Amino acid sequence: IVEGSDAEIGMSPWQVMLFRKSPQELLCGASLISDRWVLTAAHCLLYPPWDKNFTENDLLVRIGKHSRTRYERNIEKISMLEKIYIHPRYNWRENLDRDIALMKLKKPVAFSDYIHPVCLPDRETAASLLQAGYKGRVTGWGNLKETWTANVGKGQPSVLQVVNLPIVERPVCKDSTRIRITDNMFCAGYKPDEGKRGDACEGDSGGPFVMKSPFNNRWYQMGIVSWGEGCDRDGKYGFYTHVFRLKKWIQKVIDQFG
Amino acid sequence: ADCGLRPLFEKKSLEDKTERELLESYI
Ligand SMILES: *C[C@@](*)(O)[C@H](CCCNC(N)=[NH2+])NC(=O)[C@@H]1CCCN1C(=O)[C@H](N)Cc1ccccc1
């Protein structure tokens, strides 16, 4: 997370950490939407251009973490995966169109002060809130900077990072990149003449883009961190998977079996 | 069905240090 700030304890109870069995590594963020279902980005699990192909087997899942590095004894829960469901039409070949996957845990989890699911938006809620200039929030344990080049400062946070970013007018989004954009996407962050900065980065995918309802003082997952070009660059914006456009498949996989 | 309400915050009728910002952008 670029230019964010240390998250408060229990501030983002659905935050999930995708973790590699060996080598032990943080792969992505993810979120809790039930005590059995987890939502992330598909490129987190499968990205052939880079030799990426993780099976249920290769990973762990950590719910309740704050510290990135340290094992929080009676707070965190390490779960194993039963299944992985990737959108049949996720386009890894070109623009990462439909960058979504679902993970159902081996056994349910029990909610606590640090473990609590987030809502998925309804028709009403999507529409009411997915307005340009409306601010959402991002959380992660990803890169504090563009790490593939020589830089000063630490490259990764010790604790959960949080950033609050405005939604941008598609046209702005559209014109900001040579990458083919789609209805399943939305770009967010500040404009070079706003004076505020911030963005998500490498290691942030799968993390939620959440919004609070003025209507029911409830948090909803509107986006999934997806892709971007560098991090916190002027005249560029981060791209997030459009959760509302994807609910249909979402619900379909979630309710299949009883 | 209990989703999006935080124990240490909404469960507590408490607020996070920067959620107003968000509430303030929603026209
Ligand atoms: C998965 C990730 O953690 C990461 C998130 C990047 C978000 N960036 C910003 N600034 N908010 N995603 C990626 O790194 C993805 C996966 C593969 C390439 N990629 C990119 O973001 C590239 N930088 C650009 C790109 C290449 C191909 C298709 C889509 C985007």
**Domain architecture of chain B: domains with CATH:** 1-27 (4.10.140.10)
Q: How far is B3 from chain A (nearest CA, A)?
A: 5
| Angstrom distance (rounded) from CA A97 to CA A41 | 11
Determination technique for this entry: X-ray
| Domain locations in chain A as residue ranges | 1-12+118-244, 13-117+245-258
What are the tokens at A81? 């995966």
Residue of A nearest to B1 (CA): A119
- Classify residue A29 by burial, with Cβ atoms within 10 Å: 0-12, 13-18, 19+: buried
- Classify residue A79 by burial, with Cβ atoms within 10 Å: 0-12, 13-18, 19+: buried
Superfamily grouping for domain A1-12+118-244: Trypsin-like serine proteases (2.40.10.10)
Q: Please give the CATH number for the structural domain made up of A13-117+245-258.
A: 2.40.10.10
**DSSP H or E stretch at residue A38:** strand A37-40
Distances (CA, A) of A232 to A15, A143, A254: 22, 11, 35
Structure resolution in Å?
Answer: 2.4
Helix/strand/coil for A106: coil
Contact B16 A119 (CB under 8 A): no
Nearest to residue A108, comparing CAs of A192, A26, A35, A5?
A35
Q: How far away, in angstroms, is A178 Cα from ligand 1 center?
A: 14
- Residue B1 CB neighbour total at 10 angstroms: 5
Kindly state whether B18 is in contact with chain A, defined as any CB-CB distance less than 8 angstroms.
Answer: yes
**DSSP H or E stretch at residue B21:** helix B19-23
